[PDB]
Amino acid sequence: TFRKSFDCYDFYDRAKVGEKCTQDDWDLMKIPMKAMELKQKYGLDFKGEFIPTDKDMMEKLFKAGFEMLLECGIYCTDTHRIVKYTEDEIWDAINNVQKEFVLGTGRDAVNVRKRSVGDKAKPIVQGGPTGSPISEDVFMPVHMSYALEKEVDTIVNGVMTSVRGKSPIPKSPYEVLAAKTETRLIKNACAMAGRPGMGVXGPETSLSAQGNISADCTGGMTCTDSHEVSQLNELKIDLDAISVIAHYKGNSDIIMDEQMPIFGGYAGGIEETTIVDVATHINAVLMSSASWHLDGPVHIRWGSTNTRETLMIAGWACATISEFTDILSGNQYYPCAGPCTEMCLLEASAQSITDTASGREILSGVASAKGVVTDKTTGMEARMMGEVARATAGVEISEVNVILDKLVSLYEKNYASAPAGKTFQECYDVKTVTPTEEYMQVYDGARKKLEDLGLVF
Amino acid sequence: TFRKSFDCYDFYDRAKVGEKCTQDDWDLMKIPMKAMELKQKYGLDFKGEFIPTDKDMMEKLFKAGFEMLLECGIYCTDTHRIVKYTEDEIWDAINNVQKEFVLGTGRDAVNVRKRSVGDKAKPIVQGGPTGSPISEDVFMPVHMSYALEKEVDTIVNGVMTSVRGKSPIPKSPYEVLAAKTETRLIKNACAMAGRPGMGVXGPETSLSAQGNISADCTGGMTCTDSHEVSQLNELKIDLDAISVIAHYKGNSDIIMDEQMPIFGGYAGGIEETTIVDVATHINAVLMSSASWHLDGPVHIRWGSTNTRETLMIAGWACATISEFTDILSGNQYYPCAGPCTEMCLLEASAQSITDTASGREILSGVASAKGVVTDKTTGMEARMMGEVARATAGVEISEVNVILDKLVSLYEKNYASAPAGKTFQECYDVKTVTPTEEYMQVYDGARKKLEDLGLVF
Amino acid sequence: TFRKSFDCYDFYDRAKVGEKCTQDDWDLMKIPMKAMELKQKYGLDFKGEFIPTDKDMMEKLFKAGFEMLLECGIYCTDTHRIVKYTEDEIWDAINNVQKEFVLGTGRDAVNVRKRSVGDKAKPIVQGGPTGSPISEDVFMPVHMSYALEKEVDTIVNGVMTSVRGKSPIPKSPYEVLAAKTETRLIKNACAMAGRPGMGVXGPETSLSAQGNISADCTGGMTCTDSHEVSQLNELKIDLDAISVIAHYKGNSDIIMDEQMPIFGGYAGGIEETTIVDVATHINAVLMSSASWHLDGPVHIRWGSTNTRETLMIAGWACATISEFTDILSGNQYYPCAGPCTEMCLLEASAQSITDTASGREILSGVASAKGVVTDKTTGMEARMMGEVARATAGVEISEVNVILDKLVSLYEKNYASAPAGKTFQECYDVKTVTPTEEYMQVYDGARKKLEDLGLVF
Amino acid sequence: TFRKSFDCYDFYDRAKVGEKCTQDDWDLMKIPMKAMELKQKYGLDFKGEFIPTDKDMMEKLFKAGFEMLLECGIYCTDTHRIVKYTEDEIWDAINNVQKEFVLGTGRDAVNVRKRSVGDKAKPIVQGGPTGSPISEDVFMPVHMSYALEKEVDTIVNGVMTSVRGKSPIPKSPYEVLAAKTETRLIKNACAMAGRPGMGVXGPETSLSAQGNISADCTGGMTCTDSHEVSQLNELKIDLDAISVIAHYKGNSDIIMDEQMPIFGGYAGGIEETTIVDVATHINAVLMSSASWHLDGPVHIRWGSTNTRETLMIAGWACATISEFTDILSGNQYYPCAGPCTEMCLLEASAQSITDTASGREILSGVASAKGVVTDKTTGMEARMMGEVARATAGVEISEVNVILDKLVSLYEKNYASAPAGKTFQECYDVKTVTPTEEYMQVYDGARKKLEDLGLVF
Incomplete structure (x- = not known):
């Protein structure tokens, strides 16, 4: 049996004395070799499906992910050593996950409970700039554009490009x-939208351990909000995150561990990256004591989470995690196109369909324009994400796979030419925080195309 | 109809003017006569089953328990008088019980909802010294050994053998x-384990009404913890408990009424003691306004809750209460053997199997070494209790009865020679609060035997 | 030096092994002998003054009180043994008393800071039924009659003659x-008077340790209220109080220790009873860890706190305690006459003059009709207590002594024929909680007589 | 005029673009040159006094300290640049300091208000291990030894040598x-001592910014506790502290900025080090937005704060700060000798006399054995610190200087042979947390010598 339930403290202990290994030996050898080995040994083949309908293949994927984590372990960047788990420790973590939890407070609180593949229940819609850079002078208005949407349940924080007119440089006051x-500021925006108790997910502007740890405060982040800790790529972590985890645990905070596996990255192709994805979902409840895990498969070239490959990775990982564990999870949205464009909405829609049907409990979006363009995120993208989730709930998986194949084909040849889109200030009336007629028309166009594909709103 | 929903105040009123009766007339005549009468009138025969599969027999057991309470009433030790209920008052209590509740706070809180016989859902694991005497200098470490186990959801408090180096004599400051x-101290131990909001069950060190009533305090017991009030043996209560109940109710505290019927005690044999057990489950929501009831059938000779007879009593009482009422309940663990012994683990395992399959919502253990030996309780026993509960969830009752018969036969001939076991200090590294290799090996041995019997972990 | 600062735990320890002594040996020998001895040794003679102007005599009184406590100790009724203190332990207690504190919350909170003899600052006016029996159906209105008076700062709780129509029998639910x-209920009455945060003093209806300990609760007593613990007569205590003290301390509650020395009681006459009074003021911060001490010298025959003798005892004890220590204190009011009578108002006025000029920080009244007649207490008596306190503040002590001599002579020959007075229902419009014209006229009459004596309102 | 009131954000801004300077250029040239220059220009000569009686010399010392800060600025270690203030910015900080504040909560809270030189009011006694290393298994008992002393008002935290049996390595979880x-744990110890609301000062075990920032938590440090940020030596700071300051300010925490000027260090001798001391008292309210400042002049060779020179530095700095500003402050205690020795008590006593008479509001001690020996700190040292403070309050400064000269001469020739003393476990009964007869006798011996010198307890 295991000595004790594994936690961040055991991780630190092991990271200091584990097998010495260069990061290249990890990224260019250990990880790709194991993913390759397990894919072939288990004969993993997704056969073009976004969401699996073959439970036998799903079980093999689960075993592969478990074995990936067990045989490889986790690489610690700061100590350049490998941390290994025992089979019993992993099972103790999987066998005792958070069953459910509440986000937000008062009338605005929402319950997060497990969803199954094809569940009739609608996932939680976590809308916001999704870590995208937002100008200080419109920080509240931008977030209010999400709180004003009934489709949105919780808020995912954006990043302040400045505070008191200064850049929030890491390790600076x-x-x-x-x-x-x-x-x-975000909760104040929610209050102005008549929803003072909306839960949030962050912190996002801070990057260092000291910055992240300072986020819990009166009027700010509290135990009813999702606290983010980020895993690295792939099956890797830094000590900063380990200390942040200790802090979240010590404050009885709901912990959201995230990991964005890279398709075409160190793991390899589709099945290989999915094995890593399953492994990191498990690592979340083991290393980070996560309450829930946020996925986000991203294309090495396009940097988006809604390409055919990344959607398949997410769909299979989630359906498998949903079938064999009670781990609560979500997925994050990074479309190529910017706001006020039909492509952006269709991209997010494809992912919403995939996430909803595959069993995700939370949809966290939308980081339009790949989340790297200042002020290019608005509540309209979250509205579509939510409406599409409702349209998808309860739909037969066979039908969902057909719809996805058709939808993704509508934009997958335009990644390189994805429209830049516009900023919040350009497609919204900033004063009243309402979308322009231009955006409403673009929205209708996208919705019509989705209906032509079979979606019923 | 009834005048008003019955409560502790009505009990006091009636206890002062009820039928005068000596305690011997109650223990040696009224109780045994009624249990004997109802057993035969309803033809109760459990036919060797630990968990019933005959719903007709279960219904007769329910009617017998209800009638036991209705016809006998409750003996008040302080006034030497009998309190009687009316049929309508009893039904009003049974028809309006607490549906569900939450224990603990923040990320660490857990929901307690009704379970059915053979339910796939796992019961709540309430681990702790279970009222056993614990040395002051290791009070926190001992409790931390439970909080560190992911298997454990809430803590059941141990008893401080001293506070500030002095014995906590009843009615002394x-x-x-x-x-x-x-x-x-216990919640501080939970915080050190990274789970500040874990709920607890107590108070345990105090014995008088004034001591128990002083337990609610800042940093200490609060409304999200289970508050214990104890019924006496059998269908009996003292006025101290009645005042404590008034206090718990006045503070909006979750109330856990407990009663440990004695097999071979005043009630008589198996079926007789089970009739009393059902009667006390009902009395819990009537006299104590309980949120949930904690059972604990104990063998008159061995003083354990996991003998063949006591397991049958618990299994039938719970399955019946689960079938005909919505009363939430749990069972407490008192093995004969001490920590770091195979027998102790097998004893607790037999009870976990029984409690889980019979429908218990909460498992409160483990009071190893019969809970009377200083420092002889550790988190390892609770870990087994929890893992066995998971293994049992969803298993067919017919199969469970077979497994129990085989398991109990493995130790039921060794009660008189049950191993003393070791203290926390002997089988744990007190500094890091981790089990020794010795204990881990003993644990594996017990687990292997359980697997050979058919349990799948 | 001392082993540790003395507290209730040390008291319990010593009470179990101290010198065995019958209560008669204590009351009829040890106490009267020591008081007699110290009076003569220090040549104490108050020479008719209500408030001392001879600092040398005051210092001798202080030394006598200290020595009374040091040489006698405290008799524990439950163990029939004597608890002794060391000189160093007593000084550690006197040298480290609570400097100040706040009662109540929000806008309604008030600061309690030390007052000197003849201080221009007005003492805190704690008005209420002062433990008198109040009918359940008018419990709120009666207390509201005090909260509605701007003269009143905090409330001193009355006693509920019934709750839910039943007598609150000690040790019953x-x-x-x-x-x-x-x-x-009292804080709800204060809220209706537009003062939700008024502090209170209690608990009063409960008499047992378990009842007193249950008083702290949401919406009820909290740390910003004065928590009462009562010493016995004379230099005596029961274990119930010792446990209540441990409870108050454990909840960070402001503690008000009270002791009502009996003139003509076990101690003897005026100077003798004052020596005991000083001794109990000191015992308050030692045994009870008091935040402040409530005095209340009462006449053995008349049962009032405002006779010539009891006023002199209070005046000398307080002036002396104020001169040589920083112990915060107050005095309680028990007039012979009932509400709506001129005598009642004059009696309370004499005490208010005495308490204010002698240095009391808090005036707790008024228990009209000796506090033993149901519903015979109203806010009008507290209004007079407060107005007289303002009139007295800053007045030369020589002048105060003259006024007191004249005032007390106005009623001291009528103790046996003191008017019964009326109930709240008879001298107030219960619906609007306002005094009748009858009472307002009686009030004016008393006020006029006080003005004729020299008081300026 | 100034652009804006100076704060940590302005400091960061300036630290990034200020004059480049090597640390040696700062320590070996700029600082010693300016201190030397100002000492001579103002003709500073303390003429052997511990506490000044020459207000003209005091005013010159104030001007020198102000000018030291204005002309030198503050060296930032991380950027190797100098931050400069303007005269107007410094005055804005001095002209707007925190007038007073409250530490702790409930009955246990205490008010901190300004004291003058020779004030009759007693300073706040902040007792504790004072950052000394304390074994994990006695962490609570050791701190309880301070809470049990009525002399102690607040607690100054010790350092955990281990947590869960592991070293709290900086930047580790x-x-x-x-x-x-x-x-x-410390507040739990205070609660066990019957003082749940005692305020504390920390955090102490953590050393990194991330560790310090994680200290605010439920059940742990809160806004009613003093939050420590440390300045470096001399007129120097690191960016970690700057971020910690931003955190404290953002949480509305009471901030305690500390700086321990080294006699014989970079500044030079007595007057030179005092100029630096005054400069750092001012820098506290400027750079750190301090609520109060903790001094601690230490001897370069002996490492103690109670040598003749360090006492003179503290006395002059405080008397001057008290005379010309309203800056609240305290001093910390580092005796050479260990617990249970007469020298240790006499050393702390000399400092208590100096701090009390010079105007300190808070006494933070005692770090016996120079605070570097595991478990060598007990409440007895704080008791002496407190009793001596009471004895000193109100005493004429001329008399205090005479007493100090005599007292310091009693031990100043024995620094090299200062007795090692004993640990808490050796001079206290760990179970009851009470001093041994051995310590009580040592205590009496020290007290007697202090009385022979003229102190009246």
């Missing part, structure tokens, strides 16, 4: 100021 | 100090 | 219900 | 665990 201020 | 300190 | 309900 | 656990 401005980073601490931003960490606390970020959620304080 | 030290009893009050211990009542408040007990949970304050 | 009704006592617990009353303990919590008492303050809940 | 154990550091975060210790940061939160430290105060949680």
Whole structure:
């Protein structure tokens, strides 16, 4: 049996004395070799499906992911050593996950409970700039554009490009100021939208351990919000995250561990990256004591989470995690196109369909324009994400796979020419925080195409 | 109809003017006569089953328990008088029980909802010294050994053998100090384990009404913890408990009424003691306004809750209560053997199998070494209790009965020679609060035997 | 030096092994002998003054009181043994008393800071039924009559003659219900008077340790209220109080220790009883860890706190305690006459003059009709107590002594014929909670007589 | 005029673009040159006095300290640049300091208000291990030894040598665990001493910014506790502290900035080091937005704060700061000798006399054995610190200077042979947390010598 339930403290202990290994030996050899080995040994073949209908193949994928984690372990960047788990420790973690939890407070709180593949229940819609850079002078209005949408249940924080007119440089006092201020301003925006108790997910502006740890404060982040800790790529972590985890646990905070496996990255192709994905879902409840895990498969070239490959990775990982474990999870949205464009909405829609049908409990989006363009994120994208989730709930998986194949084909040849889109200030009336007629028309166009494919809103 | 929903105040009123009766007339005549009468009138025969599969027999057991309570009433030790209920008052209590509730706070909180016989859902694992005497210098470490186990959901408090180096003598200021300190220290231990909001069950060190009433305090017991009030043996209560109940109700505290029927005691044999058990489950929601009831059938000779007879009593009482009422309940663990012994683990395992399959919502253990030996309780026993509960969930009752018959036969001939076991200090590294290799090996041995019997972990 | 700062735990320890002594040996020998001895050794003679102007005599009184406590100790009724203190332990207690504290919350909170003899600052006016029996159907209105008076700063709780129509018999669940309900209802009355945060002093309806300990609750008594623990007569205590003290300390509650020395009681005459009074003021911060001490010298025959002798005892004790220590204190009011009578108002006025000029920080009244007649207490008596306190503040002590001599002579020949007075229902419009014209006229008459004596309102 | 009131954000801004300077150029040239220059220009000569009686010399010392800060600025270690203030910015900071504040909660809270030189009011006694290393298994008992002393008002945290049996290595998760656990355990110890609301000062076990920032938590440090940020030597700071300051400010935490000027260090001798001391008292309210400043002049060779020179530095700095500003402050205690020795008590006594008479509001001690020896700190040292403070309050400064000269001469020739003393476990009964007869006798011996010198307890 195991000595004790594994936690961040055991991780630190092992990271200091584990097998010495260069990061290249990990990225260019150990990881790709194991993913390749397990794919062939289990004969994994997704056969073009976005969401699996072959439970035998799903079980083999689960075993592969478990074995990937067990045989490889986790690479610690700071100590350049490998941390290994025992089979019993992994099962103790999987056998004792958080069953459910509540986000937000008062009338605005929402319950997060497990969803099954093809579940009639609608997932939680976590809308927001999704870590995208937002100008300080419109930080509240931008977030209010999400709170004003009934489709949105919780908020995923954007990043302040400045606080008191200064850049929140990591390890500077401005980073601490931003960490606390970020959620304080966002909850104030929610209150202005008549929803003071909406839960949020962050912190996002801070990057260092000290900055992230300073985020919990009065009026700011509290135990009813999702606290983010990020795993690295692939099956890797830094000590900063380990200390942040200890902090979240010590404050009784709901913990959201995230990991964005890279298709075409160190793991390899579709099945290979999915094995890594399953492994990181498991690592979340083991290393990070996560309450829930946020996935986000991204294309090495396009940097989007809604390409055919990344959608298949997410669909299979989630359906498998949903079938063999009670781990709560979500997926994050990074479309290529920017706001106020039909492509952006169709991209997010494809992912919403995939996430909803595959069993995700939470949809966290939308980081339009790949989340790297200042002010290019608005509540309209989250509205579509939510409406599409409702349209997808309860639909037969066979039908969903057909719809996805048709939808993805509508934009997958235009990644390189994805429209830049517009900023919040350009497609919204900033004063009243309402979308322009231009955006409403674009929205209708996208919705019509989705209906032509078979979706019923 | 009834005048008003019955409560502790009505009990006091009636206890002062009820039928005068000596305690011997109650214990040696009224109780045994009625149990004997109802057993024969309803033709109760459990036919060797630990968990019933005959719903007709179960219904007769329910009617017998109801009638036992209705015809006998409750004996008040302080006034030496009998309190009687009306049929309508009993039904009003049964028809309006607490449907569900939450224990603990923040990320660490857990929901307690009704379970059915053979339910696939796993019961709540309430681990702790279970009222056993624990040395003051290791009070926190011992409790931390339970909080560190992911298998454990809430903590059941141990008893401080001293506070500030002094015995917490009843009605002395030290009893009050211990009542408040007990949970304050335990929640601090939970926080050190990264679970600040774990719910607890107590108070345990205090014995008088004034001591028990002083337990609610800042940093200590709060409304999200289970508050214990104890019924006496059999269908009996003292006025101290009645005042404690008034206090719990006045503080909006979750109330856990407990009663440990004695097999071979005043009621008589198996079926007779089970009739009393059902009667006390009902009395819990009537007299104590209980949120949930904690059972604990104990063998008059062995003083354990896991003998063949006591397991049958618990299994039938719970399955019947689960079938005909919505009363939430649990069972407490008192093995003969001490920690770090195979027998102790097998004893607790037999009870976990029984409690899980019979429909218990909460498992409260483990009071190893019969809970009377200082420092002889560790988190390892609770880990087994939890893992066995998971293994049992969803298993066909017919199969469970077969497994139990085989398992109990493995130790039921060794009660008189049950191994003393070791203390926490002997089978754990007190500094890191981790089990020794010795214990881990003993644990594996017990687990292997359970697997050979058919349990799948 | 001392081993540790003395507390209730040390008291319990010593009470179990101290010198065995019958209560008669204590009351009829040890106490009267020591008081007699110290009076003569220090040549104490108050020479008719209500408030001392001879600092040398005051210092001798202080030394006598200290020595009374040091040489006698405290008799524990439950163990029939004597607890002794060391000189160093007593000084550690006197040298480290609570400097100040706040009562109540929000806008309604008030600061309690030390007052000197003849201080221009007005003492805190704690108005209420002062433990008098109040009918359940008018419990809120009666207390509201005090909250409606701007003269009143905090409330001193009355006693519920019934709760839910039943007597709150000690050690019955009704006592617990009353303990919590008492303050809940009173604070609701304060809220109706537009002062939701007024602090209170209690609990009063409960008498047992378990009842008193149950008083702290949501909506009821909290740390910003004065928590009462009562010393016995004379230099005596029971273990119930010792446990209650442990409870108050464990909840960070402001503690008000009270002791009502009896003139003509076991101690003897005026100077003798004052020596005991000083000794009990000191015992308050030693045995009870008091935040402040409530005095209340009472006449053995008349049962009032405002006779010439009891006023002199209070005046000298307080002036001396104020001169040589920083112990915060107050005095309680028990007039012979009932409400709506001129005598009642004059009696309370004499005490208010004495308490204010002698240095009391808090005036707790008024228990009209000796506090033993149902519903015979109203806010009008507290209004007079407060207005007279303002009139007295800053007045030269020589002048105060002259006024007191004249005032007390106005009623001291009528103790046996003191008017019964009327109930709240008879001298107030219960619906609007306002005094009748009858009472207002009686009030004016008393006020006029006080003005003729020299008081300026 | 100034652009804006100066804060940590302005400091960061300036630290990035200020004058480049090597640390040697700062320590070996800029600082010593300016201190030397200002000492001579103002003709500073303390003429052997511990506490000044020459207000003209005091005013010159104030001007020198102000000018030291204005002309030198502050060296930032991380950027190797100098931050400069303007005269107007410094005055804005000095002209707007925190007037007063409250530490702790409930009955246990205490007010901190300004004291003058020779004030009759007693300073706040902040007792504790004072950052000394304390074994995990006695962490609570050791701190309880301070809470049990009525002389002690607040607690100054010790350092956990281990948490869950592991060293709290900086930037490891154990550091975060210790940061939160430290105060949680200490407040639990205070509660066991019957003082749940005692305020504390920390965090102490953590050393990194992330560790310090994680200290605020439920059950742990809160806004009513003093939050420590440390300045470096001399007129120097690191960016970690700057971020910690931003965090404290963002949480509305009471901030305690500390700086321990080294006699014989970079500044030079007595007057030179005092100029630096005054400069750092001012820098506290400027750079750190301090609520109060903690001094601690230490001897370069002996490493103690109670040598003749360090006492003179503290006395002059405080008397001057008290005379010309309203800056609240305290001093920390580092005796050479260990617990249970007469020298240790006499050393701390000399400093208590100096701090009390010079105007300190808070006395933070005692770090016996120079605070570097595991478990060598007990409440007895704080008791002496407190009793001596009471004895000193109100005494004429001329008399205090005479007493100090005599007292310091009693031990100043024995620094090299200062007795090692004993651990808490050796001079206390760990179970009851009470001093041994051995310590009580040592205590009496020291007290007698202090009385022979003229102190009246």
